[PDB]
Structure formats: C-alpha cells, structure tokens
Amino acid sequence: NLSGTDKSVILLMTIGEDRAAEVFKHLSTREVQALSTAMANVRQISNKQLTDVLSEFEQEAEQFAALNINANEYLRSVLVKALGEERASSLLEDILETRDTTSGIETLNFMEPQSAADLIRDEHPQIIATILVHLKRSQAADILALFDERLRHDVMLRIATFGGVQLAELTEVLNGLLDGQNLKRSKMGGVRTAAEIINLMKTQQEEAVITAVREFDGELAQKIIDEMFLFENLVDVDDRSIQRLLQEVDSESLLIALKGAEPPLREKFLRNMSQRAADILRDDLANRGPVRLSQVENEQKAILLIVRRLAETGEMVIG
Amino acid sequence: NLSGTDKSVILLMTIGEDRAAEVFKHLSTREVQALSTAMANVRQISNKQLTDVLSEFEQEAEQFAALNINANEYLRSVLVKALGEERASSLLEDILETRDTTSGIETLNFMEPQSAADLIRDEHPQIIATILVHLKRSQAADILALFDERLRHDVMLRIATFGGVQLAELTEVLNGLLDGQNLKRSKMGGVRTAAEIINLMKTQQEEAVITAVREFDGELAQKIIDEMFLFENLVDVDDRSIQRLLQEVDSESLLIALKGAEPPLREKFLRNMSQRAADILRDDLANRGPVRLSQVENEQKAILLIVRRLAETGEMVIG
Amino acid sequence: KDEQLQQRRANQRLGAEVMSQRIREMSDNDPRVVALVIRQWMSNDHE
Amino acid sequence: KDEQLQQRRANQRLGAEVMSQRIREMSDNDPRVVALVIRQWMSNDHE
Amino acid sequence: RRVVRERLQALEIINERFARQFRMGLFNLLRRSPDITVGAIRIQPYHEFARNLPVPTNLNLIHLKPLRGTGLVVFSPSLVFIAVDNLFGGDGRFPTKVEGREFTHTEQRVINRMLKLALEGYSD
C-alpha cells in the first residue's frame, strides 16, 4: 500500500518543475519542505505505484472537469474592464480576510485550549473577549477556563462592552498572532517528558531526584508526582481499571509485582477478582518466598508500560 | 553463500568509477574505506556470484521503478524559478537538521547509555535535560541513571525549567557532540579486558597481580575481583545455573574440578543433582585419590570457558 | 525471464512518459482541473 | 572439458559485460533507481 | 620603577556606544533584552590586573592592526553559563559553578559566538 502523501509526492514530481514551483507558491512552506525532503530521500513511485498514482490522478481529473482557469488575475482583468479595477480590490481583500480569519478561528478551535490561552494571556482583554465571541462556544469557554479569576471576569465583563464589532483590524490581529506560532515550536516544555524520563531512571536515582526537586520546589515536585501517579491507590485509577489490568496481565507477573506492593495495593488488586481467583492469588503470594527486588522492579515496569499503553489507547482515564 | 556486504561491494565495482565516487560522496567515509579495502584485497564476485549479485540488483531495479532523478539541485532549480531560491534554503536546512537531529537521537538511543552519559557528563546540565527530553523515555532514563545524585537532581529540576524549546542551536549541539565520537575510539578502556587477561594468566601470577593492585587501589582490585566472579558462590550464579553447568559438562571433569574446590562449592554443585547422582559424585570424589593440581586447574579453566560461552549465549545471567 | 522483465519495464516506462506528457498537456490547457486535484491531494495527505 | 569450460567462462564474461553496460545505461538515464537500491544495499550490509 | 598618569575622555563614550551595540546584539541573539553596566575605566599594571582577575576565566587575544600588539578580552564563567542556558532557554535558578575544569567543546563554541559578536560590535 502507498500512503496518500506518497502518491501526492509522486504526482508532484511528475507534474513538472514549473508546475511544482507554482504549487509550492500556492501552498504552505511546510508542504514545500516536505515535498523537497521526499524527492531528496527516496522516490515514492514504483512501476505499479506510478501506475496507481497516475490512474487515481486521472480519475480525479475526469471528476474535476469544468473547462475553467485559476485566473488569479485573468478573472480580475475581465471584471476590471466591465466595472473598473477599484470596484474589487478592497472587497476581494475583505472576503479573503474573512476566509482567512475564519480559517484562523477554526485553527484555534482545533489547537490546544491552554496553548491558545497562554498565547493570548499576554494580549489585551478586549482581544480575548472578541476572539472568544468569534470562536465556537466550546472553544471560547476552553480558552476562558484556562485564565485566572480576575482576567476571566474582566473578559466576560468586556464581552458585553464589545459593541464596536471591529473590521479590518480584527483580521490583522489574527495575522499578528498567526506569525508567532511558527517561532513557538515547544510541544515538550510541559513537565511531562521529564516525568517520563524520571520514571525511566533507576529507582534510587529518581528518588534522589525527587528529593532534590522537593528541595528546589515542593509545588513542582508535587506536580511531577501527580504526573507520576499510576496505580498507587484505588481512587485515582478506579476499580474498573484495576479489573482491566488483572485481565490483561499475566497472573504470575502480577503476583511477583504484588510481592513488594503495599497491602492496600494487594487489597485493591484482589477485590476485583472473584473468590476463587483472589484465594489463588493470596495462596500463591503466601507460598512464594523472597525474590531479589531487581526482577520485581522489572516486572512492575513492564506492567506499568502495559498500563501506559492502555491509557494511550484511551479505554479509560487514570488519575 | 555470499554475504550482503560482498554483493554490495561487487555491485560497487560494477557500477563504474564515477558512480562509485558519487556513492562515496553520498555515503559515509567508513563505508568508503570498507569498499576500498574490499576492492583492494580480493574481488567479491565469481561467475555464479556475479550472476547472483547482478540478478538481485536487477530485481531491485525492477521494483525500484519511478522515472525520477535525485535532483540534489535540479529539483531546487525548478522550485527556484516558481517561488524564488530563498523561499527554500532555510526551510530545507531546518528539515534536514530535523532529520539529522532525529538521526542523532536514534543513534544515541541505540548506543550504550553509560557511554552517552559520560560523553554528556562534562556538558551543560541544560544540555543533558533537553537531550533527555528529546530522547526516548527509556533512553533518557538510562543516561539519567548513570549520573551522580546532585547532577541527576539538577537535570530533573532543569527539565521543568526547559521552556525555551530551542531551534537551530539544538541541531548544532548535536553536530558538536557527533564530531567527538570518531576520535573517542576506546571500546576496551573498561577494566574487563585486563580482567580476562588476569584470568588467562598463571594462577600464582594473577594472585601476585591481585595483591599488587590491592596495594595500588583496593577499590579497583575489588571491582576487578567482582568482574572475576564466576561460580565461586551460590548466590551470585544461582542454583538454576549451577544445574545448567552440571548437565552441560562432563561428570568426570566436574568431579576432578571439585577435588580442589571448597566444600561449599561441592554442596552447591551437589544440591541440584538428584539423590542418585549426588551419591555417585560423592562416592567418586571420596574414592579418587590426590591428583597433580595442574590437570585440575586445566579442567577448571575449561569448565569456566564453557561457563563464559554460556554467558555469551545469554541463557542466564551470572553475578 | 529477466530479459522479458527488462523489456516490460522499458515499455512501461515509455507508456508512463507519454501518458505523463498527456497530464502535462491537459494541465497546461486547463489549470482548474489542477488546483482542485491538488486540494484532493492535500486532503489525502492530512487524512 | 577444460576447453569447453574456458569457452563457457569467456561467453559468460561477454554476457556479463554487455549486461553490465545495460546497468550503466539505465543508471545514467535514471539516478532514482540507483539511490534506493544503494539504500537497500546498505540495509543488507548492516543486516 | 614604573609610573604613568593621564586623563581620558573619548574612550568613555566609545565604550558606552559599544555597550549599547553589544546590548542590542545580545538582545537579538538571545531573544531577551540584556543590560550592560560599564564600570569605571581601570588603569593598572599587568600584574595587578592579573591578580584582580578571577581565576578560572577565559581570555581571548584579538590583534589590532596596524598597531603592533594584541588586544585582550575576558568573560566570566557565570556569564558563559547564563548565556548558554538562556540559549537553551534555561531559567538559571539552579546554577552550577565550575572551577579549574576547562570549558567543554560546546562551551568553547558558545564562547566563540560571544567572541565573534563582541568583535563585530567593537569593530563597528
């Protein structure tokens, strides 16, 4: 199978260099870079693949039949002789900005609410109020929720005061905030990647790191520990997920993990099982003797990896 | 059978000198040196072998069909006329560095964690934190585990402080650390090769060497002795591996080795065997008289060589 | 066998290049059928 | 016997060199089918 | 016996304008506006300056043609640490102090960027 990108990439090579440059101009620079990298690395089309991409493009051309030109100038020239060039430039720019500002509105709705809020946190409360009004009511609320109480209250107060409904400047405001995203990058700043690495590190090493960060900042340490939280107590993970783990992990591995686990952990991991299964697990735990903690920790790490995979699949929430 | 390298080497001779030089430019200098050595020593293709390498290359060419050029310039030239040369250089370099920095990330994940840690131990704690964040959470933990407590705690503390998510400089940082590996060489520095040679040396000679290094450094001597440790006690090697040895080594050789062994060694090497086998071994040890220690030491060395071979196969761990 | 496959590849390349010239001429004579299919391409890429 | 084997080697060399010229011409007319097969070569080498 | 006295006017203004240029250069380099406080111009023997110099620290030689001799610049380990962590975006609220330990390759490279930027600023 050939992915949709690869078919498009092969078509971009096939359509010619001048057409490819025109498409690059008509499209996004990230797409231009992706196509350039693709044509630099390995060509995406084989003889069967080239046949497939060319055939599907042909079926697209058959269906996309309209006998028309793009006319990013020819259409305007026909309009200009009939009515004059001026009776369009301003209106066309306004229409494009309306398409552009709606595009930005949808993009902000799709992208993460707290990221939008912090991008707009420094901005004017009037800006926040008007963008909230323009956004979807789910999206507007999501940006509003991530604010402090005073700023949020001022935002709702100014929502009513926003009666000017201003129009070219609003589009330029969206343009200004748009130009700041490509520099933002980030996408790892949040104390989650370091948390995963702390989990990955050797037990005593992350214990020392936890002590050191508690000395550095107790609040930050507590936040990272809350990020740590994975089946250390019943309420955070819930009895249904406790049941889910036991039916998805080997019983011997679960018992070996429970050897070094707390008695509340054993109780929470035995309540879900039936009477027979709970009795079998308890008898096995009682009969099995002491084992070197390295194997217990390794099996616990494997179990927690399974838990993380389940959370990534998103069957149930943890915390 | 012809190895994959040899087929590739023969194809490199066959494709021509100019094409070979272009491939050398497109590939790594280590590969260039390997190909040069191969074509200098013995040609890799016979008449059947040349047929095989050429045929498999042909099947690669049939499958690699796409009617495209590498265009490490032609593709850019078509793009430059349509949009301009500048609307690419920076973005293409950024994309390549992203491919390059991800390549370095994967390389660091593959290569040894303690080696990575010591290569980055001298470097900035911010560098360590950001590289840990970028790496896989298993790899990030592995580099973190090999640090001292203070540096490790500072690393986790700075993981949260890393909010700048910087972007061209990060790639250049990976370039700087990359250029230091080819000079590092090493791969024998660790007190393991000397340990093997100490094992290889004559009994009294390595005993004197052990005394001398104890005088030189007791900690170093203890580390080298821990590296020595091979079936001198039950806990380090485990009863299952003790059972594995006895079922893989000749009984007469095992008994002759046990003649000079400690009574705890005899007990640990007799517990695994059944009652009949243990009684037979004990009776044989009692009946057999004194033997010159040279043969006993030689058979012990052969047995320990078998143990080392088993450890290399990796069925079970020792220590 | 191998020679037949090589000839098949050669004639397939010839057909592919002449039919690609057909794409070139139709795209030259009608840009509208190009932009919408590019939109479909990016739709497939992001989907 | 030996003479027949020598003639077989000679004609095999002639066929090998003309077919290697076929590789040369196809690589000259299409570099893309070269880089990917080089990638496959290095994949086989490291595998 | 070695004695010299004098009073200077122009190099004060020269240092001030070079400091403003260096401040804006560092601002654009590290996306954060710095502040530079120029101390009073010091006239002292070489041995006195060396004694006052906080070891360890990096010293750099910059020749000044056509005048015979080479100019000298120095930068503190605190400055290089802060600049490099800001380059990484680090807050710097968990700093480290290195004494006697020579600068790594990456640290020397960052020093190289500061050196070239300062050279360009003072040149203009």
Residue numbers in the entry:
A (entry chain MA), B (entry chain GA): 3 to 168, 172 to 324
C (entry chain LA), D (entry chain FA): 514 to 560
E (entry chain HA): 44 to 167
Quote the study's own text.
Rotation is driven by a flagellar motor, which is a supercomplex containing multiple rings. The C-ring (C = cytoplasmic), which contains multiple copies of protein subunits called FliG, FliM and FliN, switches the rotation of the flagellum between counterclockwise (CCW) and clockwise (CW). The switch is also the site of torque generation for the flagellum, through an electrostatic interaction with a stator called MotA/B4. The switch also connects to the MS-ring (MS = membrane–supramembrane), which transmits both the direction and the speed of rotation to the flagellar rod.
To inform on this pose, we determined the 4.6 Å resolution structure of switch particles containing the extreme CW-biased FliGΔPAA mutation. The CW pose contains significant domain rearrangement, particularly in FliG. As a part of this, FliGD2 changes the subunit that it binds, altering the domain swaps. Finally, these rotations increase the size of the cleft between the inner and outer rings from 30 Å to 40 Å. FliGD3–FliMmid undergoes smaller positional changes, rotating approximately 25° as a unit with a slight adjustment in the binding interface. In the CW pose, FliGD5 rotates and presents the MotA/B binding site to the inside of the ring, with torque likely transmitted along the same path, albeit in the opposite direction. FliG has a conformational difference between CCW and CW poses that moves the binding site for MotA/B from facing outward in the CCW pose to facing inward in the CW pose, which changes the direction of rotation of the C-ring. The CCW and CW poses of the switch also help explain cooperativity, which induces the subunits of the C-ring to preferentially adopt the same pose.
